[PDB]
Ligand binder design. Structure first.
Ligand code: IMP
Ligand code: IMP
Lengths: 186, 186
């Protein structure tokens, strides 16, 4: 089985390919920007994205929308983690959290999958907290400031294998794969 | 630092050496034949090649394999792109594609790297479509019938600079370097 992953994020590609490759599934990345609507849930962005993409890209295909939700900031940046990352950056997040009595936050990943006129969503959530300073150079995005619950290292201090074993994306991929096993040949 | 590139393709060595040399990495070609297995996935050819080369060549070392995958032909010629080009040729591909409305296809490159007891893979993909006729005299192989997404010209109608900016191998090399920059000292 070969799945087309519509994304422009190389980090997501490596993580998804590493996870599913373990089971003999091939991932073929396809950069094709799609509208990412403003909405309350990552699930809404994925629903609109699949509806938009169908008929314009090869099947079966998958997309992924993820975000960091900081408790003391009422869930911000959340669905708009990308814009915030590219504007105020990690430095901005740390500045906002200066003196915070609660640095907890959760990362969430939502994978959209489409095949033969059927759409599905799988997701995963990993709780943790924001570090006081950037640490590590592995991974991407907010990895240098997110410490998953139970760990002493930020995602950026972990290998891709270690990150996948604990991350929101690894969890979404597990949910997806468990579904695949009882539905499709692979 | 030095990386041994196990290959007998002069043009490929030049491309890889030129790219990685930009970042102080010295590519040293080693003409050591190795088994390229029959497989549907470039990843399997690379995995087997690396596993076979282990202990037979100096480290760290890399190998690469790529191919053209045509949607309407179930991915053919894919891993067998070279052989198909030498036998049925571009004439054969166009013949098979006669009447096909869906002419989508993609070039995919997979780089394999071995260092400190572990193997790593990196990929690059360039989407496009198969033309209705051969055009251009630049490049090689399937370039005369492949039009990259976003362009009207076939790879053969482009200068080396224009093609390189859209190259699937170039993308694989970029991914490989981003990994090297974070994982190795030099
Ligand atoms: O595993 C992750 N580590 C760090 N940042 C991530 C991760 N997953 C998603 N992001 C960030 O959340 C934003 C993702 O984009 P989106 O999927 O379009 O919502 C990007 O800014 C990423 O940097
Ligand atoms: O940019 C390209 N143009 C034309 N053919 C290509 C290109 N990249 C890969 N190929 C085909 O795939 C072959 C195999 O590749 P290699 O393992 O990358 O050396 C070549 O023999 C070509 O037939």
């Amino acid at each position: 089985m070969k799945i087309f992953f519509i994304t422009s994020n190389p980090g997501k590609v490596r993580e998804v390919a590493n996870f599913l490759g373990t089971f003999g599934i091939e991932i073929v990345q396809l950069k094709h920007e799609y509208p990412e609507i403003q909405a309350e849930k990552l699930e809404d962005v994925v629903d609109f994205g699949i509806s938009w993409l169908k008929g314009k890209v090869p099947e079966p295909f998958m997309i992924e929308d993820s975000g960091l939700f900081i408790e003391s900031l009422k869930g911000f940046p959340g669905v708009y983690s990308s814009y915030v990352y590219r504007t105020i950056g990690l430095e901005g997040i740390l500045k906002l959290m200066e003196g915070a009595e609660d640095r907890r936050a959760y990362f969430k990943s939502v994978i959209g999958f489409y095949i033969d006129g059927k759409a599905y969503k799988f997701s995963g959530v990993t709780w943790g907290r924001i570090s006081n300073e950037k640490r590590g150079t592995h991974g991407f995005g907010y990895d240098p400031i997110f410490i998953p619950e139970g760990s002493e290292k930020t995602f950026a201090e972990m290998t891709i294998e270690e990150k996948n074993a604990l991350s929101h994306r690894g969890k979404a991929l597990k949910a997806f794969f468990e579904w695949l096993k009882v539905n499709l040949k692979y």
